[model samples]
Target chain A: ELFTGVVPILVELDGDVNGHKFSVSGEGEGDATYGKLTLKFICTTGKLPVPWPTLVTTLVQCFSRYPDHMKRHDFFKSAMPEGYVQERTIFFKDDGNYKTRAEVKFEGDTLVNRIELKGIDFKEDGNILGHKLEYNYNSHNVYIMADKQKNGIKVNFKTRHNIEDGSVQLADHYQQNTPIGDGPVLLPDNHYLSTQSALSKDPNEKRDHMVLLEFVTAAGIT
Target chain B: ELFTGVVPILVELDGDVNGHKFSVSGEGEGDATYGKLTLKFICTTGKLPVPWPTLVTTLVQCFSRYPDHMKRHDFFKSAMPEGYVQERTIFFKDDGNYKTRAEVKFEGDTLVNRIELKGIDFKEDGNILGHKLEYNYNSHNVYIMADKQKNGIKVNFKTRHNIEDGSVQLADHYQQNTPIGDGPVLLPDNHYLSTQSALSKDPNEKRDHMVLLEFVTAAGIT
Candidate 1:
């Protein structure tokens, strides 16, 4: 397609797909000089056999040790396959439902992303077994799905239960991306990123993810 | 004799009437109002046994005590004859040839006088004695004599010592009355008598004597 402004929406998967339907939703904008795009996904079923807390703590620990890498790589380690790792080897005692959502932004194929996991439930034997995960896209829309094991392999395999049951609906499916589409997806500029790094290192640092995102996007995009 | 004017001059006596002479040398106005009468006397010989040191100190003490009396009384009590008591008891330690000169002014029966006792030598003692006594009188003129028997008795006796022959002359030989008389007998005014009584009682009270005089004499002699 000889698309002058044809921006492709790409999905990069990693680790075990585990029957988890990685639903994606996002918005973006482009000008003659620069452009940006953001995407999100969620898993609704067949969670990992790892506790949500363990997974979150491991992720945070990893981020703390390599915060710059985490930001620069957009929460995805390119050196690892599928851009994700299973925490089973690190936390052996954890066996629970683990669901997660991820967000990604693209500027001419250079991507930055963040992912969140939730709805982890422990098995009857106190082993965390499964969970439903919901994801918030850069477009501010939520997507959910379920993960499952099929044919002895994990896969993202289920549609969002709430969307199928009509409890939630996608507001707009194929709207044209405008400046408004460039909302929260914008990555922070270098100055803002440095400032955020300094603030995060402080002992009194608070979790202000929303504010940080807004500040970063405002400084970076505008 | 109706005296006119007189000027008194001092002379040294010779021979048997050896005495210090106070000769009056002045022309009389030929009227009693302006009459000048002059008289002379020879000072007695044999230094006074009374010491000037003792005399001055005793006099100062006595005078200081009844300083008021020094102003008031012409004569102190026998126990403290205003002037003579001081001479006898206080100045008696000195033994020196001494003589006094006096000048008298008479207006009718009243006399106002100034008499100076010079050549008073007090023995060289550590005490402040043996100084000449200068007497300035606003009232009368009086004489002092020594008693032969009384060791401390000071008589207002009249005597002269002839410097020429070194012989002593006495008023007893010159005249029964003091030959040096041209003015009324010295008497104390009421203020003087009162001051003398005050001084006799308390010697320190003498300072008040001058103050009292100043008050009494605030109205100058008309």
Candidate 2:
């Protein structure tokens, strides 16, 4: 199980994993020494305090965005659009229709590596069309949203444990639109879209905010 | 001869100027150790490319905007609007029509010291008029444009050699309006109003370029 294809990871990092470079692009060739790596993926369904999902779809987009071995590294190089995946990849499984293992592997030597997310059969026009991520330095959080059907599941994958407090939330006030949901999720007053980052600007209080952006809105639609 | 107030300078810095910060503000007291000093006046005629006039004006509204030593210091700090005689002064020769100076002094032993500019002729409504300056770091140049009546001669004062290289120039083309040229003068295709700096971008290359914001259009506006 220690060397299994799938895994669950928190902030605690696992380095020296068999002398391989641990980056957000997963594993690669060479002495695993070229550059730096980055963050892994974490998924969830519905709002953090809202309804549960019938199936498991949330998953990892990359093991890390770092290089196994290198001195310098880059961040959100430029604006990326559509299927144009930039750094890592994460393929969630279809817990209902089938049982799938975490699909992970290595490509040849190149400036960056690619990842394949295989599970419950996915296509551009399927249940889960696509996902996009963006980072805000001032806020120190990533806005990760995806368009989907059957289950409108999107999450604000953040680094700050809690930047949303006392935020007058509208998304949470309404019932779950559950079953058939899609794009531009209506996120509540919290991290990603909130003016403040996850951690409160003031050390004594919570950074939790209210009323925020898209993909987040999609999670609210039925 | 070596301390003659007027001289040409290049950015390739010649720092050993007797310890004083020889900024656009007209020169000042003590060996720089006593305090700070700045330039005094700003000059110019009609638009560029004009049949220029002879002696009458080449002044700073220091006549109208005194406490002289300070304003000459502000010109290099921002892009001024109306009578907002912002920066410190750079008191050049007077217009001869009148001999007047706000002549202020300070021995308070603070951070800044006072300076006196008493030479040539100068007067507010009597003759000399106005001036302005802006710095663009993208090219490391200072665009200084002045408008006076008697002389109607404005020049691009820079810390770099030929800050008007490829700057589209009209000063070399048109005829001077002679009198009543006013405060806010018409600029050439080189600085400010032109895509370059308020003074000019390039004197040769038709520097015509984009949508810009504040003082910068980009010191990188110092």
Candidate 3:
């Protein structure tokens, strides 16, 4: 009740923000004035559906060419054990969890925050195995608020609300003129895990492949 | 010089800050206004030299009895794979990394911050494996500054500085009367890893077993 304690959280950055497409999945923890998450930018084949907010061009190139990169550099390919390999997925790790940190500001009923990609050390096989490709950038600025019922949650960016969950609805103050306009209605479920799929840049991709934001412990699991 | 990029950082919480002992090893990333780390509180013989700040008594009891708990609870024992069972260590996971969140306030040359153990989901043998022993607390407050040379760094909390690295030294404004004051002199070496050990509650224990703090990246790793 005091707005303290720590809990696992899932945040999906769906729809357009600042004229760029994003469908990001963030899983981490929120405490005090901060939320730390690991941002997973998934790709299909060799196509990246959304752009990563980074000034470092090499970092973007790495993700874009991840499929071919692993094939050319057999080191990462051979590094995978038998059980770890999945279709179109080779290396997956949560070891360095919470690479994204969001500093939220609470002003009465409104919460303002920015998602920043901390530092990501990239391994470039072309140069050396441990060649560092440092990527850090401030992504989108987000403004959020809960409905009067304290049941539905709303964001500044656009999102697609799935009706199956029966939890999300558009916020009362939701505006079309906002930065990344348009999206689905959503509600907050502090009791259980809540997930919502947002629009994906890839039209052919299924809903599962869209931008997903989830709340593991929305009300703080104490 | 902008201090905007993200980098992997290692912070060693050594010595006395606000009196209760702390020698923690934190490994994670730092970006914008925050440093998120997985604080590894190590113990041997089921004894915690430093206290965890929390009103919940069960959390402390769980850590204190980790040794016997694992021994009695065969579920966790069976959960362990062959190689995961290390001496005196049964369960070790880095999946949920960076459980400790530190919010740093930067003012000119000084940095003020607080370390908080966000939330830890504890599993108890007697009360079901998923018993959910939730733990969260705000820990020590720290003030830090670098020397004129900026080669060494110092903290408000007293800590022991090892001379082997020739990297650490006392800060210019270091005071003996500061909260939990006194500690080792330290230097900043952004290129490599830096580590130091502090006094442990158990006097008979070896230096390796004492309180420790380390920095993986100092002055930001780019």
lDDT of each: 0.22, 0.20, 0.23
Q: Per-residue lDDT of B1-222 in model 1, one digit per residue for the tens? A: 112222222222211111322221111111112111222121244332232111111111111112322433322222221122222211222243333432233335323223334334434541223223211101111232323334222323222211112222222111011213322333333221101100001112322111001001100112
Which candidate's lDDT is highest? Answer: 3
Residue-level lDDT tens digits of model 2 in A115-212: 32222333343222221111111111234333235222233332211111211111111011121112333222211211111100111223221111
DockQ of model 1, rounded to 2 decimals: 0.00
Candidate 1 yields a Cα-based lDDT of 0.22
Candidate 1, residue B201: the lDDT equals 10
| Preferred candidate (DockQ higher): 1 or 2 | 2
> What ranking emerges by lDDT with the best candidate at the front?
3, 1, 2
For model 1, how big is the iRMS in angstroms?
57.2
Candidate 3 residue lDDT tens string, B1-222: 222344343333333322334445433333322221222233323433323321111110000111222222211112211101111111113111113323333324322233443222322321112222221221111233433342233333221111212222111112111112123323222221111111111223443232221111122223
Per-residue CA lDDT of model 1 for A1-222, tens digit only, reads: 111242444333233223333322222222211111212222223333332222221121111111323344222122212223222222122333434444444435433334443433334443233332211111111111112121011111111111111133111211111111312221212211110100001113232111001001111112
Instruction: Give the RMSD in angstroms, all C-alphas superposed, for model 1.
Output: 58.2
Task: Give the Å shift of residue B96 in candidate 1.
Answer: 99
- Against the native chain B, each candidate's TM-score is 0.23, 0.17, 0.22
- B55 Cα displacement, candidate 3 (Å): 12
lDDT of 3 by residue, A1-222 (tens): 222344333433333322334444433333322222222334322332222312111110001111221222211112111101111111112111113333333324222233433222322321112212111111111233434342223333221111212222111112111112122223222221111111111223443332221111122213
Model 1, native contacts kept: 0.00
